[PDB]
C-alpha cells in the first residue's frame, strides 16, 4: 500500500476541480496547496485537479466532489492513485459540448452565462473526456470536454479560447448522470444518513467479502418519519452512491392492481432484484400494502401482506439484496414486518432542526442567483415545523415569485427564451418573505426532538443548581469510567418543584444544551389530549424516541395539570404507564428524565420512589442578586437607556418571580414602544417607563404560598408514607 493509494470520501469544498488531503499526507507525498495533481481511477480513466489541505480529512482518505468521482468512474470507498502533475501548461483552444437532456429547454449563448464565470479567474485544470457541471439560471448543465489543444489535459488561462458549437451530444451508456440523486442532495439528517451508510455499504459494496465471513448482513431497513422528510430521497441516494441496482415498489401502485397482479408484481420485483444483485428494493408507502392486521379487513388485502412476508423470508437466499421501506406511521405497519429476519432495523428520520433546515435551504438554492439581502439562516429559524418538502417547495415558490414580477419583459420574448436574462433574475429576501407568509407547514403537531438553544446565560441565579445538574447529567456521560471505579450507578431522573415562574423549564433545556444532548418536552396538557385508547401507544412512542436520540433528556413539564386531573381514568393510565416506562428505562442508556411541578402537595408519591425521580431539587424565588441577573438577561437584546438602574429595580422587587420580572420588562417595553409611535423617535427604554410599569406591577407568589413551598422543601421526600 504505497502512499499514492488513497480512499475516496465525501467532499466539503463544493468546487469541481478541487480535491483535499490531510497536511501530514500532503507532506508525505511532497505536494503543496498550489500543486496540480493527476488522479488515476478505475476503468483506466484519469482526472486532473487542484489539491488542498483539510484538517478534518483522515490521512488514509481523499475528499473529492461527485463530479470528480464520476470522471474517474469511482464511488465512495474505492481506491485511487494520485501523482504530481507539474507538466500542466496553459491551453490554446478548448472545445466543450453540452449534454442534450440538460440543455434542450434553453437557447442562446451558453458560453457567456455558464462557462465564462466558471473559468474566470479560476485557472481550472481540466482533462479531455471530463464532464463538469455548471449551475446557474435555475438550471444545472454539464459539459464534456471534447478536446484541448494541449491534450489530454491543460489549465484554462484567460488566453485559452472556447468553442461550444454543436448540437448537444447524447448520453453515453456508462456516463451516469449528475442530475441523479446523491448524498449531497440530502441535509438536516447527517446522523441518520450515516447509520444507513454503515449498514448498507459493507454488503452492497463488497458482496463477496460478506459471503466469505458468514456473519449476517442487514436485509430489512425501515425508514420512518413524517411525509416529505426525504425518506424516498435517501433510498435513491444510497442506491446511486453504492452503485446498487434500485427497484422501486410504490405501495399505492401495487394496491391499485387486481388480486393476481399485485401478488405477481411483488414476485417479479424481488426476482428482478436478485437478478441484478447487488440491489436495493425500496417499498415506498409500505403501510399501503401492510397496515395493522386489524385494519386490513378484506381477503385480497390479507393475501398481499402475507405474500410480502413470504418474499421477505425468501431473502434467506442471501442474494446480495437489501430491502428498504418507508412509512409515515411506524405503528400503522403490521407488526409481523418488524420481526427479526424481515425489517429488523429501523431508522427515525424525524423533522429537521434549525441547523438542518438551513442545510436544506442551501440545497434548493444551488441553481438560483440569490440577492445579498437574502438571509437563509433567518428563514431557517423562522420556518419551524417545516419539513424537507416544505422548504423545497417554498424555495420554488420564492423563485416563481421573482419570475412573475419580472415576467413583464419576458412575455414579448415568449416566442423564444431569454437565457442571458435568466441569469439577471435575482431572488430578493422579499420573495422569501412572501413565500413564508404563504407557506403551509405540515409537521407543526409533531413532537420536536433537537438540542435546545437555551444556555446557562439565559438563566439568572440558581448557580449551585446548575452545578448539581452537571453532576447528575453531564458527568455520567463524559466520565463513565469514573463511576465504574466508585462502583455507583448514577440516578435516573430529577424533580423540579417550587413556585411558578422561577426557571424550572429553563433549567431542563439548559442542561440539555450544556451536554449538547437532544431534548424532548412533553407538557401535562399534551398527555391529557391523547385519546384515551390511543394513550397507551403514544406514551411508549415517546420513550422510544428518547432512546433513538440518546444521549437525551426527557422532560415532563407542567405535571401539576395531570395531578389535578386525577384527584380521571385517562390521567391515571398515562402516569402509571410513564412510571412503568421509567422502570424499564435502563440508566446505562444515558436517557435522563426530569419532571417539574408547581404543586408538590398533590404529586403522585410513586413518582418520587427511589429509582425514578428521586433527586428532589427545590427551585425558589430569585434572591436580590439573582433578580439583577435575570433583568439583564431579558434586556440583553433590547436598547436600554443608561439611566435605568437594575440594582435598585431588583431591590424593590423582592418576592417577585423570574416570570414577573420578564413581564415588567415587557410592560415597560410596551410603554417605550407606544411613545415611539405617537412621537416619531428611535425608541429607548428609560427610567420613566420602568417606574410606570412598576406602579402597576403585581406579585404572582403570595407570602402564604412561600411559607408552604419552604415547608415542602424539607418534607417532600416524606410523602411516600402517610399524607401530611
Amino acid at each position: 500500500n504505497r502512499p499514492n493509494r488513497l480512499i475516496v470520501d465525501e467532499a466539503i469544498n463544493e468546487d469541481n476541480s478541487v480535491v483535499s488531503l490531510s497536511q501530514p499526507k500532503m507532506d508525505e507525498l511532497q505536494l503543496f496547496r498550489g500543486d496540480t495533481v493527476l488522479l488515476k481511477g478505475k476503468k483506466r480513466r484519469e482526472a486532473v485537479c487542484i489539491v488542498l489541505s483539510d484538517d478534518t480529512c483522515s490521512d488514509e482518505k481523499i475528499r473529492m466532489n461527485r463530479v470528480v468521482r464520476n470522471n474517474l468512474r469511482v464511488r465512495l470507498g474505492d481506491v485511487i492513485s494520485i501523482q504530481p502533475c507539474p507538466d500542466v501548461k496553459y491551453g490554446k483552444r478548448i472545445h466543450v459540448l453540452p449534454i442534450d437532456d440538460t440543455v434542450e429547454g434553453i437557447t442562446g449563448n451558453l458560453f457567456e452565462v455558464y462557462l465564462k464565470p466558471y473559468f474566470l479567474e479560476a485557472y481550472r485544470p481540466i482533462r479531455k473526456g471530463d464532464i463538469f457541471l455548471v449551475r446557474g439560471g435555475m438550471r444545472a448543465v454539464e459539459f464534456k470536454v471534447v478536446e484541448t489543444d494541449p491534450s489530454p489535459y491543460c489549465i484554462v488561462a484567460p488566453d485559452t479560447v472556447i468553442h461550444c458549437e454543436g448540437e448537444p451530444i447524447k448520453r453515453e451508456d456508462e456516463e451516469e448522470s449528475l442530475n441523479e440523486v446523491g448524498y449531497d442532495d440530502i441535509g438536516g439528517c447527517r446522523k441518520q444518513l450515516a447509520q444507513i451508510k454503515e449498514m448498507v455499504e459493507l454488503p452492497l459494496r463488497h458482496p463477496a467479502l460478506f459471503k466469505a465471513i458468514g456473519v449476517k448482513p442487514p436485509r430489512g431497513i425501515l425508514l420512518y418519519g413524517p411525509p416529505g422528510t426525504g425518506k424516498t430521497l435517501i433510498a435513491r441516494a444510497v442506491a446511486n452512491e453504492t452503485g446498487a441496482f434500485f427497484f422501486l415498489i410504490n405501495g399505492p401502485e401495487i394496491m391499485s392492481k387486481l388480486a393476481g397482479e399485485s401478488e405477481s408484481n411483488l414476485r417479479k420485483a424481488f426476482e428482478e432484484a436478485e437478478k441484478n444483485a447487488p440491489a436495493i428494493i425500496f417499498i415506498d408507502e409500505l403501510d399501503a400494502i401492510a397496515p395493522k392486521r386489524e385494519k386490513t379487513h378484506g381477503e385480497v388485502e390479507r393475501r398481499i401482506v402475507s405474500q410480502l412476508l413470504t418474499l421477505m423470508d425468501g431473502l434467506k437466499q442471501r442474494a446480495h439484496v437489501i430491502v428498504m421501506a418507508a412509512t409515515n406511521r411506524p405503528n400503522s405497519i403490521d407488526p409481523a414486518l418488524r420481526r427479526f429476519g424481515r425489517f429488523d432495523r429501523e431508522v427515525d428520520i424525524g423533522i429537521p432542526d434549525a441547523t438542518g433546515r438551513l442545510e436544506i435551504l442551501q440545497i434548493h438554492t444551488k441553481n438560483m442567483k440569490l440577492a445579498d439581502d437574502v438571509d437563509l439562516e433567518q428563514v431557517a429559524n423562522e420556518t419551524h415545523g417545516h419539513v424537507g418538502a416544505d422548504l423545497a417547495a417554498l424555495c420554488s415558490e420564492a423563485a416563481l415569485q421573482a419570475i412573475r414580477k419580472k415576467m413583464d419583459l419576458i412575455d414579448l420574448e415568449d416566442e423564444t427564451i431569454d437565457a442571458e436574462v435568466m441569469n439577471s433574475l435575482a431572488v430578493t429576501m422579499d420573495d422569501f418573505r412572501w413565500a413564508l407568509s404563504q407557506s403551509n407547514p405540515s409537521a407543526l403537531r409533531e413532537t420536536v426532538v433537537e438540542v435546545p438553544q437555551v444556555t446557562w446565560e439565559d438563566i439568572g441565579g440558581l448557580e449551585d443548581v446548575k452545578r448539581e445538574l452537571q453532576e447528575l447529567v453531564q458527568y455520567p456521560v463524559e466520565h463513565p469510567d469514573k463511576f465504574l471505579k466508585f462502583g455507583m450507578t448514577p440516578s435516573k431522573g430529577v424533580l423540579f418543584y417550587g413556585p411558578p415562574g422561577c426557571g424550572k423549564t429553563l433549567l431542563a433545556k439548559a442542561i440539555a444544551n450544556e451536554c449538547q444532548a437532544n431534548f424532548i418536552s412533553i407538557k401535562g396538557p399534551e398527555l391529557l389530549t391523547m385519546w384515551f385508547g390511543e394513550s397507551e401507544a403514544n406514551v411508549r412512542e415517546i420513550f422510544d424516541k428518547a432512546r433513538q436520540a440518546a444521549p437525551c433528556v426527557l422532560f415532563f413539564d407542567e405535571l401539576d395539570s395531570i395531578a389535578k386531573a386525577r384527584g380521571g381514568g385517562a390521567a391515571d393510565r398515562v402516569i402509571n404507564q410513564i412510571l412503568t416506562e421509567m422502570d424499564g428505562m435502563s440508566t446505562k442508556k444515558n436517557v435522563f428524565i426530569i419532571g417539574a411541578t408547581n404543586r408538590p402537595d398533590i404529586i403522585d408519591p410513586a413518582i418520587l420512589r427511589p429509582g425514578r425521580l428521586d433527586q428532589l431539587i427545590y427551585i425558589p424565588l430569585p434572591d436580590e442578586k439573582s433578580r439583577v441577573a435575570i433583568l439583564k438577561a431579558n434586556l440583553r437584546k433590547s436598547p436600554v437607556a443608561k439611566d435605568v438602574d437594575l440594582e435598585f429595580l431588583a431591590k424593590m422587587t423582592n418576592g417577585f418571580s423570574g416570570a414577573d420580572l420578564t413581564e415588567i420588562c415587557q410592560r415597560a417595553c410596551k410603554l417605550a414602544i407606544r411613545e415611539s409611535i405617537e412621537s416619531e423617535i428611535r425608541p429607548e427604554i428609560r427610567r420613566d417607563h420602568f417606574e410606570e410599569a412598576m406602579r402597576f406591577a403585581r406579585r404572582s407568589v403570595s407570602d402564604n404560598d412561600i411559607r408552604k413551598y419552604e415547608m415542602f422543601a424539607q418534607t417532600l421526600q416524606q410523602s411516600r408514607g402517610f399524607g401530611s
Partner: peptide, 11 residues
C-alpha cells in the same frame, strides 16, 4: 460536425 469554428475566450 467536428472540432471547432467560432470563438470565445474573452477576458
Amino acid at each position: 460536425f467536428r472540432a471547432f469554428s467560432g470563438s470565445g475566450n474573452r477576458l
